[PDB]
Subunit: 380 residues, 4 copies
């Protein structure tokens, strides 16, 4: 299902390298796809190959040793290709990819003081040396920096083989994101990921129990604000490519199956057109919103608040559309293929479980999406 | 939960109610073993033994032949909903007993004269707890043939046979070969030589339903043990309804369960964001539609179930048509209710072990079941509307 | 049409069957006039006279007080469905008569001591074919208020809107606030056509239901004698009951409309021969939704009939018990009756887009259900969510 | 409106911008005349006269030939969106001119050698404001034939839903040609040809201002110098999908605009109305989401059409499909969601909008016309799209 202002071909030469680089892992990812789901395990042997070949440095700037992909359009594109084979992997890789871009931004436009830190991190990631995961969602109480760090985060995809965590916290005497090494004392990685889908993503819990952190590794974060919407967009929007990829994958499998099969009954034609029509909408909506985030990513010239809303609002329309239609496309695909797809090991079963992850992801889920977008529309 | 007048809320027959009362003592256990039974994808045998022994598996055996005399598809569907609200897999398995009682009963009272004694025998054994009978219907890897110097040979494979593990007999649909080709349903004992039951069940959901494969490799069958079945007719549609319609109960019960789980969760949080009110209304509206459309189709099937009196082809269409409309609605709205419940609860529901996960997964099974899936349903229903 | 076992298919009561048999002779005429009544947006008086004189408008008056004795919301809805298949705007007007029958009959048997004779009189006149009674419910241009003049007489001031069938009425039950002295209370005064200060406007221009004559009435200092209830902003759930009784049978109208759209499109499709892949899927989805509508509305009507004359339990719960099914049904009907009609029009194609085409009329008529109170979508969501959540 | 980056918000070409500015001056009158034109079902002749005399009916005529050189379907859709926000039937009528500019341009540059001088003539006449050309396409009461004698030409039949036919000076008539084997053709017939009758029978539920009347051709004399060639009947030719796109795709802007109008009216009303009940926030979010979809989806399909409009370099059957396919996904999405959005707006405003003279009533009636327009309605759309997908 081809689209023009679509998520179909890369916009930048850099991004184009990444897709070419990524081409060699597809047959592999596909090949292990089942076991990783069955066991809910991140494919480490594979992540090393890719780290060592400089995939994990994709969004790291040219100068600091990365491939210099600086386009969310292109990141999303790459995640879609992966997601079509293993979406939990895509979900894991996103953490790095986005981390590449969030860091680049701080390096150039952030607090005067924290540019060197960003630079180290970015340069490290470029060397194929750091694997970084933001750890955001607090569980059983909130997570506390006092420097000694105490707390527990949840669903940190890829923490299994991460070398450092960027950790959202409340600093106590306001807000901050200490960068904490894997090898730090009093840090634990839990083996508790039991997702219905996204299982190869290893979204495990992390415990901080009186962990050391030097001020040389603290990035500050405002106070416990519309301009922040921009960062929130930058860090999540390419995840939308994942679900588009899942949808395309379902479609391929079903079209293949239907083609070797018949024959085209009346139910089959209608549903196929329904599927391709949504797929088309998914591509154009997602690409539009990505175009917006990319255009504004590096433009701090205007009013920074309206700049924030300008990035989030489309992101949120797209997410609303994706969370509704990517699930529906997958469902209709499973329907067209039939019972064989119900078997848990079958690729559609995996895609059906995988695709349902998107709707809880923040910002925003359905409830909070409604709040935001109606407020945009109503003023009240 | 959501209330309807001609809904699936209350039993219509006193026999129906006795069953609901009997099933009540098992709900707590089904609920407790729900999770492990899901993880391991294992039928809960002990519980089946308890139910068998205590008389439940003979629920739809007429009171004269030693069963509980539930002759209502409506009340069976209702029973199935309740069970399905704690474990949809076991409901799917118990359906096999319940529908069998009813189809056998039809054969006992309305089938070919030679077939009746055999239907009587099977019914008595079910009522006595000595017969757990499954229908082996779906061919895999070739089709299944019975061949006839008088004596019978059975050769084939069947897939997705719920409860096949603890069954004592199977009723296997086949081609019969020598006349030209006729269809037939022999009753084949679990211990019949050449028969292998296969532990290959790994469904996304319905995992406790034990829907495994059976292989028949030169199995011997008696001439006095064959149930006769036409040839490869709209009058047959009636039978196709009796043996499946009650399953619509399973999904309504699933959606009822999801709705219970979510409301409890929202009542706990005492928010009421503007998305939450809209969804909850829309969920409840759909439940109301499911409840009424499914009961209506059930009521029609019960009314014609014992009425052989006009045109039999017409009678067939008249039972299958409402059945198919309700299935279509259930298959769309069941999943939709469950999805919206899951959305309302949020992330905790995506944990595979969580009850919503298990319902999200279980509820998707209905759309594949025949008669009919979406595509054949459309054909059937458009045919009934266009005459073409 | 489409065949549901507990659908809106056959009547549940003998008086119900009398009504259906009576309505037959008008079906040809309603159909014939349909296109003109629509184009002109004019209630067909000649026809209402026929029907008045032959006993129709007394359908829901009890047998004793000279009526047909129809007591079943099921059977009224059925009847409205039949009418609505030919002219929905007419069905809509008639509902005004039918519901009033039921509401008065309730008041007759169960209102306070003082009210029962007024009910009796009002029913008897309906029975004789002499009273034609309308509810004037919705305010426009401010609210409608009833006050005591300092001379002990009563004053009624305000404006009502969308009053179906008002133009040929002899009586209006007018919803007002009673303002005195005391706190504000609610009153439903009964006011004669000729009460001076009352004007029936000619201002009905709906995109559909054009034949329903839903005009405005001005109440310009209108006299009401000390003779002819509740309190505003006050949760009174037991009252939800009469609100159900007075509106639910309207759902039959939109079912009738969808059945018609279906019949029309199927006729065309058979006429057309070949059945393409989009047609089949659409036909199936149409019939399925039809199936849903028939069973959901029948279900809610059944609940209302079961409880209409049952006042034995907790009356607030009785109220909720009647409204909740009504409102599921209403939500489903307002989505799917519109849907089905659209699809019927899609199947038939360009010819149905011409304004005079019967499908254009049904496309327009069916859009009216969604606005009707109780409840439009937004209050529907508020009500049913409050029911589900407990707050 | 609701904002998308590659949405239908901004023009892409300088001619598109000049077209858009030129249109802002008619927007007030359109709006003022909106209710009358609808009630009476009358095409605003006068307003068309100003627009013709004033350069606008030749917007898509190239500059070299006297017009404004608007080459972009994206920009044409944009213009139609703007107009449709005030009066969709007027937008619908104008599209006859706009699309004719583009299609004639192609024939001028790429039709058969014998076609091009005829094309050039018609474009110059449009640019000069002397010609107003309608496509009379859809048959009613039999099919429409042009028979070739001595070599003279007679045209017999009926056309319908010829929007803007009443102020036309020429028609380009879809016909079967008989003699030589059975060809397809498009004779160019002048207003004042004998035997030609423009009826006044337009009674649409919506698009009431569009003047979509029937025409009757009764033994009409068409000269040999003036017959555009069109290929052959029944013969599947996917290259033809290119043209079929070019002459219809910009219509999609109308329903975007209509939906965007309903949204303006509803929000205004809700914002005036104060509080937000829990149903309102949700409907508002879904309205907005759907409009976001429609903008990006329609804009994508227009872009595709623009990229292929002049590039005839590969397989032309492939080119056609590459054009018709996104078109049809978009039409599918628009025919669904513009209708839904307008429904939901009308739900949000309440009973007032149910009054036939209310603007939302006009939009509700108007927006439903999209679903019937060919290519394709839903069923033909399903056939085409499933065929592209299954290869069968
Ligand atoms: C504002 C902005 C932030 N970001 C990133 C930088 C950080 O990694 C992250 C957090 O937002 P940031 O603006 O740095 O937080 P604060 O406002 O509290 O200082 O978002 C972008 O990538 N692009 C942007 O335009
Ligand atoms: C016709 C009919 C069949 N059946 C059952 C009996 C069989 O188990 C099954 C298939 O039988 P079928 O060959 O359709 O008809 P018959 O039972 O008369 O040979 O359906 C009913 O329960 N009710 C009915 O009305
Ligand atoms: C309570 C109730 C009222 N009604 C009718 C009678 C009246 O016309 C109307 C109002 O009833 P009532 O309970 O008297 O309330 P109020 O006079 O304050 O509006 O509803 C029923 O038909 N059935 C019922 O059970
Ligand atoms: C092939 C093609 C045709 N057209 C136009 C020119 C003519 O007005 C019209 C007829 O050309 P043709 O391709 O013969 O048929 P169709 O009407 O099916 O497209 O289509 C284009 O504008 N662009 C194109 O790429």
């Amino acid at each position: 299902v081809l689209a023009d202002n679509g998520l179909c071909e890369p916009k930048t030469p850099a991004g184009r390298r990444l897709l070419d680089l990524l081409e060699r892992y597809l047959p592999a990812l596909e090949a292990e796809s089942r076991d990783n789901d069955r066991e809910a395990t991140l494919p480490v042997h594979l992540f090393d190959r890719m780290r060592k070949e400089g995939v994990l440095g994709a969004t790291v700037p040219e100068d600091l040793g990365g491939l210099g992909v600086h386009s969310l359009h292109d990141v999303a594109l790459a995640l879609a290709r992966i997601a079509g084979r293993d979406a939990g992997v895509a979900l894991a890789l996103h953490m790095q990819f986005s981390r590449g871009l969030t860091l680049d931004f701080e390096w150039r436009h952030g607090a005067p003081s924290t540019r060197p830190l960003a630079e180290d991190l970015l340069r490290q990631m470029g060397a194929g040396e750091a694997v970084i995961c933001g750890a955001v969602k607090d569980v059983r109480g909130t997570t506390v920096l006092t420097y000694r760090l105490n707390g527990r985060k949840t669903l940190v995809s890829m923490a299994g083989i991460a070398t450092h965590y960027v950790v959202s916290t409340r600093l106590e005497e306001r807000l901050a994101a200490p960068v904490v090494a894997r090898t730090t004392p009093g840090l634990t990685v839990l083996d508790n990921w039991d997702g219905m889908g996204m299982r190869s993503s290893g979204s495990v819990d992390i415990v901080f129990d009186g962990c050391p952190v030097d001020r040389d590794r603290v990035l500050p974060r405002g106070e416990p604000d519309d301009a922040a919407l921009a960062g929130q967009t930058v860090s999540s929007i390419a995840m939308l490519g994942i679900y588009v990829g899942i949808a395309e994958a379902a479609r391929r499998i079903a079209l293949t199956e239907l083609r070797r099969r018949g024959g085209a009954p009346a139910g089959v034609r209608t549903t196929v057109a329904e599927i391709d029509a949504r797929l088309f909408a998914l591509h154009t909506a997602v690409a539009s919103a990505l175009t917006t985030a990319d255009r504004l990513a590096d433009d701090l010239s205007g009013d920074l608040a309206a700049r924030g809303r300008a990035m989030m609002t489309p992101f949120q329309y797209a997410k609303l559309l994706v969370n509704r239609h990517s699930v529906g496309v997958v469902d209709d695909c499973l329907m067209l293929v039939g019972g064989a797809g119900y078997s848990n090991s079958h690729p559609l079963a995996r895609l059906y479980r995988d695709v349902r992850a998107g709707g809880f992801m923040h910002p925003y889920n359905f409830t909070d999406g409604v709040d935001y977008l109606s407020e945009v529309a109503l003023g009240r």
